[PDB]
Amino acid sequence: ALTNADRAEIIAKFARAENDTGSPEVQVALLTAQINDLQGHFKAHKHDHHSRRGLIRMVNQRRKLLDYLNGKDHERYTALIGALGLRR
């Protein structure tokens, strides 16, 4: 799992302003870090469906935020997906 320091580094890197924790960039980066972290758990616990539901919820939330950001500003969307490595 990730710690407060790890989350703070991501927030500081992707923040668009001072004390900015609500921007789509920050939210999507946090969700991406959490999703990449959980892949290790689901490798050793393949039959844990109850947690996989929460993982799917994280994926859906990331998709919705990405679509909203693409609608608001295309340049920011491309920059964020490039910085995070997401294919879409």
Add this chain to the structure above:
RNA sequence: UUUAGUUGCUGGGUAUAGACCCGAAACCAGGCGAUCUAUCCAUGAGCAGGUUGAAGGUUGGGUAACACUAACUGGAGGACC
């Protein structure tokens, strides 16, 4: 109570022997054969030419990851002509 036998030689018959001659399928004992053939052991040799295209591998697409998937390779088989 019956009062001529016996020993030779020749001949007829019988018995024991192959016993008038020829003829089995068999049974038993001791030896000879695996240069043919059956199986096995050791050491060598042989199988023109042409098809089909298993496993495996690489790359790409796809997925939140897995799945799934296309092409290229690869050369299996009591496989095919």
